[PDB]
Design a protein around this nucleic acid. Structure first.
Lengths: 218, 85, 64, 164, 131, 92
RNA sequence: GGGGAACUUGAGUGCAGAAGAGGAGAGUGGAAUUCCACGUGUAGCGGUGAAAUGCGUAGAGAUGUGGAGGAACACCAGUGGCGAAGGCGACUCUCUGGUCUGUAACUGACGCUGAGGAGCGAAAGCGUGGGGAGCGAACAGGAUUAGAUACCCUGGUAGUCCACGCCGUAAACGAUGAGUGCUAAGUGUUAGGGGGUUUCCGCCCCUUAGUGCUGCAGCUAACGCAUUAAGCACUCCGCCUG
């Protein structure tokens, strides 16, 4: 869309003074110019993600909002890269070596429960081993195939997710992502003004991310 | 109340609509000091009015210094008829 | 949460009229505060002054 | 802007510092140490580490040093201009000394400056005399120095009118 | 009560630089007017222009921020304070920040800045250093 | 501009009722003041006992005065053995 | 800097309003406490961790009438309001100070600070004459204790109170001197003003001056401060140098 999907904005004007200083006064949507600047912004992010993904880099997808987490999860699936859906455990990329030597345990134990000798004690180890798979895989999610550090990020709510954005800022990852009206712009390289309440449009906006990253390769 | 000040301003009338004239101001000042003085003599320890007394007398005297600096002639013809030193 | 005096825009108290002060005084004789009355701030002081002059004038009782 | 560890970098230990913890069983003894690293031409960092023993303590410090570096501008083997160091009662004066004068500095400031490889510089300690606040103040200092060409760029001018 | 208009305007534009205003207003006088055009000549500022009213005028400045969101302005300093004036000889004009800094000086041949003042051998009170 | 409210004890014949209210009005109008309004309340049960009377007589006299009659009325009322209580209020 | 002619924003005067435990003086009211007289009334009251000293058959405590007296103003009451500070809460009156909003009807820089100087200045204390209900240093007794000049109990003097002088000090604190200008926002709250709604009931948006709490930038050793700066600057005073 060049039109508003569910872009009605934010309810309460408890918000952050950064870029919203003199935008025209029509309603509680005091920042109504976001409607007309979003289109040029997402297309600029579109071409930028196009050439970086055409170079051969890897994006991954982080979001723990209760309405968009599975939406971006499935989007990561059929776009063909990595994701974080549930709990962002502390320091994934600045702990990359420790995280991959923990994910090695998951790969080994899933291949053991796939084709290995399942039984040496067919209750006393198999039952909590079978638990331990989904136990780590819950908070882990789409961390099963990095083997290499990803060179870009997209976030739905950097307000909720301080840990990932600060970790990326320390690890000079270019952070991209949408900005709810309470969030803070300049710590993110390319910001896209988007209301977090748009539970329907929150997937379409990053669907417009996904077809770009799909078109970049082929 | 306000009758004495009205007659004082229209007697110290210089310009057609002057209230900002220094000669106008010190007249209302003088009546304020005298009203407060015969107030204080019957109420000696009204210190919170002694303070206003000191404020207005200081305002009076330094604006008098201003008037001396401006033109001492009109100062003289004010002082002789208002009668103080 | 409703201020009686702004609700009908009534001006100054006129202390001789009493029946509103009757239902602004507690039955044991004390003033109901703003937590139960919910009047505007600038009228509560003229209210308590009014019931004070009523109490000195002996139309409203000190204790009951 | 982060400079990787592709270069060769010299290290120099300046201080091993005894640290302690009091616990129910008694006093518990630990070792902090800070080191400064860099190259002789333009890049310098420092690193801190805590461990129970000296070699892996300075090893932790030296990996943190490999993590953090900062570039120093260098106009004719000396600093360009005036700069005072400033961090937390750490005040270090740096003055663009003339050539052939060598390094004139106190202990830790010389330890970072010679590891920066600057030929002619002179300085003074005006803040406190704890070494970590020294080095932090000095690198805050050399962080502030700018070349002439980019200042001319900000001016919309050239370098000739700014050197003269 | 406001003692030095130069100091008032000086720290006002310093304060706006440190907070990234593009807009800034300065109540007008002749002295800060030609200091405005001197700064416009030296390019520390995008544009300055004047509008007038019944109260001594009012001037506005559009302040630069370079190409990548960086401070073109790295500090300002008043020297010729009131209560303590300072004067320097024509040969003792200080090369502030050894060239990259710029000093503004009121001289007997009008007010000029540091380099042309030294070139034409003028001298006087050093008024403000900008770094 | 001063509104007056005073009480006389009920055990009084109407011959003396008119007498006291009239002489107090003459006091007010003879001390240079003018009566801008009079009102009456008659009988009203008091909020409390004062001396031995459960009851009292209420009366309203509205006077525009130059602040000379009210103090002397105050001393007359408080020296008078028939008035129990009274006040004077600036109506603004 | 000196002199001369300007101007109105700084500072002010008028005009229209608003709020206030601001102050001095006078008068008035109520609840209790104490004491006294009497009626009823028996044998305890009171007090503490236990207790004891005290008061009570000479009728106490309890209880109701009726007085005497001095004290402070319940509820209102609010990190509310006023004052420069100390501070100021019952009501009524006289006199009197100050603050804030609008207004540009008038002056045209009359401004800021302030050594010395002058004046105010909690409580305790001092002088003279009053007053003395309760409270209550000193002191008395009874407890506690190894001891207890104390903590505890029952009393209790000076004072506390008034008038007029004097002392001139406090953790007299925001442990932050006064004035001026600039710098993200959010949220109460006091007293005002303006606009659209209606000029009602009350809704919204501005708006000055305060008054609280959050919170950027910046600053600090840290705590933290943050348009009521401990930020940015300028003026003037006071002060420090283990």
């Amino acid at each position: 869309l060049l039109e508003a999907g569910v872009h009605f904005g934010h309810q309460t004007r408890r918000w952050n003074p950064k870029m919203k200083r003199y935008i025209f006064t029509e309603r509680n949507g005091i920042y109504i110019i976001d409607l007309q600047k979003t289109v040029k912004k997402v297309e600029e992010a579109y071409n930028f993600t196009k050439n970086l993904a055409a170079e051969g880099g890897k994006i991954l997808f982080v979001g723990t909002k209760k309405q968009a987490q599975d939406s971006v999860k499935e989007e990561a699936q059929r776009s063909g890269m990595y994701y974080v859906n549930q709990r962002w455990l502390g320091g994934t990329l600045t702990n990359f070596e420790t995280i991959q030597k923990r994910i090695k345990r998951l790969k080994d134990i899933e291949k053991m429960q796939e084709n290995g000798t399942f039984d040496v004690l067919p209750k006393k180890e198999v039952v909590q081993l079978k638990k331990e798979l989904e136990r780590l895989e819950k908070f882990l999610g789409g961390i099963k195939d990095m083997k290499d550090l990803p060179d870009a990020l997209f976030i739905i709510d950097p307000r909720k997710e301080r840990i990932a954005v600060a970790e990326a800022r320390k690890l000079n990852i270019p952070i991209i992502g949408i900005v709810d009206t309470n969030c803070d712009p300049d710590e993110i390289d390319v910001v896209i003004p988007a209301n977090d309440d748009a539970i329907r449009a929150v997937k379409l906006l990053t669907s417009k991310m996904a077809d770009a990253i799909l078109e970049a390769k082929q | 109340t306000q009758e004495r000040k009205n007659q004082l301003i229209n007697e110290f009338k210089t310009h057609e609509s002057d209230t900002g004239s220094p000669e106008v101001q010190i007249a209302i000042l003088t009546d304020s000091i005298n009203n407060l003085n015969e107030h204080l003599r019957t109420h000696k320890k009204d210190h919170h009015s002694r303070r206003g007394l000191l404020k207005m007398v200081g305002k009076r005297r330094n604006l008098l210094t201003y008037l001396r600096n401006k033109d001492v002639t009109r100062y003289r013809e004010l002082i002789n008829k208002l009668g103080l030193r | 949460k409703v201020c009686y005096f702004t609700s009908n825009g009534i001006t100054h108290i006129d202390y001789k009229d009493v029946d509103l002060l009757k239902k602004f005084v507690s039955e044991r004789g004390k003033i109901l505060p703003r937590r139960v009355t919910g009047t505007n701030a600038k009228y509560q002081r003229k209210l308590t002054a009014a019931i004070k002059r009523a109490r000195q004038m002996a139309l409203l009782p000190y204790v009951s | 802007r982060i400079d990787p560890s592709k270069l060769e970098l010299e290290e120099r230990l300046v201080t091993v510092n005894r640290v302690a913890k009091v616990v129910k069983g008694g006093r518990r003894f630990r070792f902090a140490a800070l080191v400064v690293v860099g190259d002789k031409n333009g890049h310098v960092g420092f690193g801190t580490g805590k461990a129970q023993e000296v070699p892996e303590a300075i090893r932790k410090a030296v990996e943190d040093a490999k993590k953090n570096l900062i570039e120093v501008p260098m106009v004719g083997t000396t600093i360009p201009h005036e700069i005072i160091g400033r961090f937390g009662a750490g005040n270090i004066l740096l003055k663009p000394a003339s050539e052939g004068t060598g390094v004139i500095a106190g202990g830790p400031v010389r330890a970072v400056l010679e590891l920066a490889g600057v030929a002619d510089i002179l300085s003074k300690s005006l803040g406190s005399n704890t070494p970590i606040n020294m080095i932090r103040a000095t690198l805050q200092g050399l962080s502030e120095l700018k070349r002439a060409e980019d200042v001319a760029k900000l001016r919309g001018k050239s370098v000739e009118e700014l050197l003269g | 009560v406001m003692t030095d208009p130069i100091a008032d305007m000086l720290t006002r534009i310093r304060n706006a630089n440190m907070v990234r205003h593009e807009k800034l207003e300065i109540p007008a006088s002749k002295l800060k007017r030609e200091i405005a055009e001197i700064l416009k000549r030296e390019g520390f500022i995008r544009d300055v222009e004047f509008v007038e009213d019944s109260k001594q005028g009012i001037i506005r400045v559009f302040l630069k921020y370079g190409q990548n969101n960086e401070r073109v302005i790295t500090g300002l300093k008043r020297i010729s304070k009131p209560g303590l004036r300072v004067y320097a000889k024509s040969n003792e004009v200080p090369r502030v920040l050894n060239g990259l800094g710029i000093a503004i000086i009121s001289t007997s041949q009008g007010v000029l800045t540091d380099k042309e003042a030294r070139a034409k051998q003028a001298g006087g009170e050093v008024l403000a250093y900008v770094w | 501009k001063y509104e007056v409210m005073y009480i006389i004890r009920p055990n009084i014949d109407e011959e003396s009722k008119k007498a006291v209210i009239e002489r107090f009005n003459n006091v007010l109008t003879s001390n240079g003041a003018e009566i801008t309004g009079t009102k009456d309340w008659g009988k009203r049960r008091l909020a409390y006992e004062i001396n031995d009377f459960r009851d009292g007589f209420y009366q309203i006299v509205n006077v525009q005065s130059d602040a000379a009659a009210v103090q002397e009325f105050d001393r007359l009322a408080k020296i008078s053995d028939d008035i129990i209580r009274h006040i004077v209020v600036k109506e603004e």
